[PDB]
XYZ file of C-alpha atoms in Angstrom:
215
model
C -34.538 43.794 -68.867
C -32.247 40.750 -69.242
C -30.991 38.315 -66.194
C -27.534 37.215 -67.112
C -27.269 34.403 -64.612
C -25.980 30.674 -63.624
C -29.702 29.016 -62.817
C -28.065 27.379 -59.588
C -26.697 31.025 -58.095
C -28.701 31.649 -54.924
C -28.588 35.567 -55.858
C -30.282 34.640 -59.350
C -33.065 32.990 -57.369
C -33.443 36.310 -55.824
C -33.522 38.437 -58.415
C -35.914 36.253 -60.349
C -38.250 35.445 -57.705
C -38.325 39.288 -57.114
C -39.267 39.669 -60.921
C -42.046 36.891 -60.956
C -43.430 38.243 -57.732
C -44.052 41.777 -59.191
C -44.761 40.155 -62.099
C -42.471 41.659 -64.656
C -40.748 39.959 -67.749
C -37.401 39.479 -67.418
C -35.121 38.050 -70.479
C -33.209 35.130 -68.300
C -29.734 34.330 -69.750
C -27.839 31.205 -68.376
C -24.811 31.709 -69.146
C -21.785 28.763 -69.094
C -20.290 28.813 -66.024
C -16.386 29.152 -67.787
C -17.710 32.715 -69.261
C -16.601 34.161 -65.670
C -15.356 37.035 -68.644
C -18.085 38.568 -69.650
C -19.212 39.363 -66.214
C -16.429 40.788 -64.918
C -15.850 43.050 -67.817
C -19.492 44.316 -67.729
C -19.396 44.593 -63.659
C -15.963 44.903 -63.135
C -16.450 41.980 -60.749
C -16.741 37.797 -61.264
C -20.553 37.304 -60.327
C -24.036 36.518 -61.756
C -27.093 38.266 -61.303
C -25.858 40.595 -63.618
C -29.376 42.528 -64.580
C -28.362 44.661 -67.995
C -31.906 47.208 -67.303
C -34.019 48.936 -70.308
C -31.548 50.882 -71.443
C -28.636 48.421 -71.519
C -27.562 48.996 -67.870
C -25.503 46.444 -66.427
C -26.186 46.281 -62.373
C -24.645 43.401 -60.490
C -25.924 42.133 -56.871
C -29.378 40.117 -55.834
C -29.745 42.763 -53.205
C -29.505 45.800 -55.268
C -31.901 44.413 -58.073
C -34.187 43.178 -55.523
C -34.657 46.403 -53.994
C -34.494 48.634 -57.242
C -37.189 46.178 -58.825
C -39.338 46.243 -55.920
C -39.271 50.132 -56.239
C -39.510 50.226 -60.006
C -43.244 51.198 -59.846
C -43.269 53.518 -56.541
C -44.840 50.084 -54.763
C -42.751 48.647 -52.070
C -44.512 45.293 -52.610
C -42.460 43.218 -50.177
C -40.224 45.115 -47.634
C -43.313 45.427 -44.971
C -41.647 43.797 -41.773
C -37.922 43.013 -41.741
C -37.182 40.475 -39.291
C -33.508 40.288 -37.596
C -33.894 36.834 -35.868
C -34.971 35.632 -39.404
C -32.216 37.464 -40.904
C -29.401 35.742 -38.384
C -31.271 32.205 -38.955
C -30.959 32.479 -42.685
C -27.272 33.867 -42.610
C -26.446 30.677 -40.296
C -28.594 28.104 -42.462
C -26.922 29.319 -45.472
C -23.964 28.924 -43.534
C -24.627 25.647 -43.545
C -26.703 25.248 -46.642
C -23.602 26.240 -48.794
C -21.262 22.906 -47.921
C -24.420 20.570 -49.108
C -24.892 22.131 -51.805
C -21.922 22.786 -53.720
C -20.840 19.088 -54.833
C -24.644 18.867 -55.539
C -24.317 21.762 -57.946
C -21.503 20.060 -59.228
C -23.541 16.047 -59.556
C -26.311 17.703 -60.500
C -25.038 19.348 -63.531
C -26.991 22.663 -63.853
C -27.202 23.604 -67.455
C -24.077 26.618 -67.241
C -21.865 23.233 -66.469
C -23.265 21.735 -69.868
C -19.554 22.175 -71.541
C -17.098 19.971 -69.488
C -14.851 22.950 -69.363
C -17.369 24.600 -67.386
C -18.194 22.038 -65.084
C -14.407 21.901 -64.432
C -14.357 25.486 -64.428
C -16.674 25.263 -61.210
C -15.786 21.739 -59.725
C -12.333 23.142 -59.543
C -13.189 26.237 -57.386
C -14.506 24.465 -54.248
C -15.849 20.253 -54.628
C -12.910 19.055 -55.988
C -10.159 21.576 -54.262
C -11.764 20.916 -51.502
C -11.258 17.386 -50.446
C -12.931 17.545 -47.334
C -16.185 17.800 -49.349
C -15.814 13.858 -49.187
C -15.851 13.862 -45.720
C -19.016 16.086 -45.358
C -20.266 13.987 -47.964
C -20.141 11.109 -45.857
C -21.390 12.862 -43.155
C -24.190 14.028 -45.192
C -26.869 12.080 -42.709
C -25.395 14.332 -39.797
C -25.662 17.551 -41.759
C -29.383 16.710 -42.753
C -29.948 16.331 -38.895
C -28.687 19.802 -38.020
C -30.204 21.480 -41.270
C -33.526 19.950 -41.076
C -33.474 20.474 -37.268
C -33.121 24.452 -37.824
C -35.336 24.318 -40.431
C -37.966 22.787 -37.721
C -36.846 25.850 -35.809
C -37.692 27.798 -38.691
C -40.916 25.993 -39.014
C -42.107 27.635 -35.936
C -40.605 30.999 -36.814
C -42.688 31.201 -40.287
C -45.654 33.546 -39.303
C -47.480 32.438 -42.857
C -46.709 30.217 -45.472
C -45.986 33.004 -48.043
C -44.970 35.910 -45.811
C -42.172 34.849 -43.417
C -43.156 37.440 -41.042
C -46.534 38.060 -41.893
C -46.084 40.844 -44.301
C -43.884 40.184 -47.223
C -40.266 40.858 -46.473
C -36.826 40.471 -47.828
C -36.588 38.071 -45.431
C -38.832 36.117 -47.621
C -36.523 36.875 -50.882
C -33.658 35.284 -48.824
C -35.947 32.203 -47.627
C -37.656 31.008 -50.696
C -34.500 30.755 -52.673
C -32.881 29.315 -49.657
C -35.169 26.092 -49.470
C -35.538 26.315 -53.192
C -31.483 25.397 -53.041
C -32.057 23.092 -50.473
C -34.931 20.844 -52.226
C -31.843 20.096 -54.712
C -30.067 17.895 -51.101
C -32.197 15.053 -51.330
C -31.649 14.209 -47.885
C -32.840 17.497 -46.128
C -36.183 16.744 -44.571
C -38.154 19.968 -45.406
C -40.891 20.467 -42.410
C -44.485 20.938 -43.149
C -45.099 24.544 -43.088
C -41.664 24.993 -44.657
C -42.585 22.834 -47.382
C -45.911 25.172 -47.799
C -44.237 27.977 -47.654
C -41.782 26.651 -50.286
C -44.110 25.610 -52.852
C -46.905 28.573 -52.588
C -43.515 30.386 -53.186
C -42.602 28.837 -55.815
C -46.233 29.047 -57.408
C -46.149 32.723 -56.637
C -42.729 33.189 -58.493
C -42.914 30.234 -61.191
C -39.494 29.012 -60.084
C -39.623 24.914 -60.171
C -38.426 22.882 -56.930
C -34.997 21.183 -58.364
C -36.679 17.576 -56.613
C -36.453 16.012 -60.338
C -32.193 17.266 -60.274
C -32.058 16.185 -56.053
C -29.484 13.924 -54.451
């Protein structure tokens, strides 16, 4: 039952919001961000959530341990209403979402880019190559417009400020993580019942808001 993970990685999020939610202890492991080894020779493939189960199982993907968790104990706890419109919003906010965050994640030095050579290791995969993160950068104040905007949209779409569509769906293990991520870009002006939604969320799954690491 251990998380091998990068604390930033929206599909860690997932996979331990889905463990606090059910309420089952889960051995997080943050790895640094320049052991991209290690996970691919346990899941034949570069990512983190790796989730290595009881009996030293390995499984990659958010999805997959989101759904296998939630069906651990016969209970699907939180798969009552999918919702596509919700589905397509989130796919486009992360859309956007993504280009904000990544130099964050790279300022705001998560703890897998402790060692230099993995903060390299990751600034050199997207911030730094590339170059037109400056220019969204500057644009930042335009970005925040159009982000918070659809998150006002959003806003209205949120039938309860814990269940996204009114009975917990994976909808909601997209969304919480989602504006989790997002409290780290300063800027972004979260919306009331968003921000509701967010933190009862967070309560619920004892993941911190990463407002102290924002900018």
């Amino acid at each position: 039952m251990k998380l091998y993970i990068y604390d930033h990685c929206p599909y860690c999020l997932k996979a331990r919001m889905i463990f606090g939610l059910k309420n089952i202890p889960v051995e997080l492991h943050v790895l640094l961000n320049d052991d991209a080894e290690t996970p691919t020779r346990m899941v034949g493939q570069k990512q983190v959530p790796i989730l290595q189960k009881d009996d030293s199982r390995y499984m990659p993907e958010s999805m997959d341990i989101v759904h296998y968790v939630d069906k651990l104990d016969g209970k699907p706890l939180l798969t009552g209403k999918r919702s596509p419109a919700i589905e397509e919003w989130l796919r486009k906010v992360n859309g956007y979402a993504n280009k904000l965050l990544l130099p964050r994640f790279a300022k705001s030095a998560f703890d897998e880019f402790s060692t230099p050579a993995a903060r390299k290791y990751f600034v050199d995969k997207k911030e730094a190559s590339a170059g037109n993160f400056a220019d969204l950068l500057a644009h930042s104040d335009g970005l925040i417009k159009n982000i918070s905007d659809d998150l006002r949209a959003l806003d209205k779409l949120i039938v309860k400020p814990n269940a996204v569509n009114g009975e917990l769906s994976e909808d909601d293990i997209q969304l919480f993580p989602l504006l989790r991520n997002l409290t780290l870009v300063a800027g972004i002006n979260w919306p009331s019942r968003v921000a509701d939604y967010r933190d009862n969320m967070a309560k619920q799954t004892q993941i911190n808001l990463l407002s102290s690491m924002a900018i």
